[PDB]
């Protein structure tokens, strides 16, 4: 917490991000660099965690791809995310959802509000 | 772990140069006019800052 750092790192905050909680499915349109081309890759999964304050805030998205679980961590205010969607909202009782790492299908399902 | 030689009188007196204890920081009371410690309640007239406690 510091008032001077808050004012300096304010023009870089992203005003386009929506409101999401840990426990709901999101789709991330991330800009990906090839050898020479720029394309957008889609990452869809459930939000596992969300920590930080201000420009230093990050969040984590988990999906199971080809039978192997993958987790991807992003800064909230990065310009490398074209846009972010909230597909569905789930009911959870935790702020950190680490129990889904030791937990496979039909038992890792999240309810809906 | 055991003294090789006994300590002389001079060497035993030099070491005790710093084993003294300092003089108390006492002060004259404003009300009853006798000695007391600074920032402390006077033990005789039972007053601090000019008000009885």
């Amino acid at each position: 917490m510091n008032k001077l750092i808050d004012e300096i790192t304010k023009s870089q905050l992203n005003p386009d991000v929506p409101s999401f909680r840990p426990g709901d499915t999101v789709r991330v349109h991330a800009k990906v660099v090839e050898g020479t081309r720029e394309r957008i890759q889609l990452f869809e999964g459930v939000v596992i965690k969300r920590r930080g304050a201000g420009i230093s805030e990050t969040f984590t998205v988990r999906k199971i791809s080809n039978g192997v679980g993958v987790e991807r961590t992003f800064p909230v205010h990065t310009p490398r995310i074209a846009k972010l969607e909230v597909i569905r909202r789930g009911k959870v009782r935790r702020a950190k959802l680490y129990y889904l790492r030791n937990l496979r299908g039909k038992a890792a399902r999240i309810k809906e509000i | 772990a055991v003294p090789f030689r006994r300590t002389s009188k001079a060497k035993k007196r030099k070491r005790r140069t710093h084993v003294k204890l300092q003089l108390p920081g006492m002060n004259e009371c404003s009300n009853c006019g006798e000695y007391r410690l600074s920032h402390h309640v006077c033990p005789e007239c039972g007053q601090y800052d000019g008000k009885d406690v």
């Binding site: 080809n66 192997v68 987790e71 992003f74 800064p75 990065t78 | -």
Partner: protein, 122 residues
């Protein structure tokens, strides 16, 4: 973070099915390898009838780890297991097809054949 005596399963079509690490190439005192690093290793469990036999000393590359890599953009990737692909003297796989997701960092290490065969390059 893979060092000597670390086991990691094989993720391609060759005969090997589990592998134990022998040495991490790159330097005299090097003691840790991560995504995109080549290691010397031995076969501890093989599927019957495969090309690669048990007890064989082979080289291999690391395609995914439980503690993944960080990109220059400030983002992170982690997987749920440590995986492995057996390679030849050059950077070509000894198998026919790859299983599971594969990190993007191999595209920066000139492992172009393994990238093409992967179902997903995350």
């Amino acid at each position: 973070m893979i060092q000597q005596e670390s086991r990691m399963k094989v993720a391609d079509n060759s005969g090997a099915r589990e592998v134990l690490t022998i040495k991490v190439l790159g330097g005299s005192g090097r003691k840790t390898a991560n995504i995109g690093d080549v290691v010397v290793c031995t076969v501890k469990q093989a599927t019957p009838g495969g090309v690669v036999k048990k007890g064989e000393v082979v080289k291999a590359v690391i395609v995914r780890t439980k503690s993944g890599a960080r990109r220059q953009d400030g983002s992170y990737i982690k997987f749920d297991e440590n995986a492995c692909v057996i390679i030849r003297d050059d950077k070509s796989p000894r198998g026919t097809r790859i299983f599971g997701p594969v990190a993007r960092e191999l595209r920066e290490n000139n492992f172009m054949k393994i990238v093409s065969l992967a179902p997903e390059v995350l």
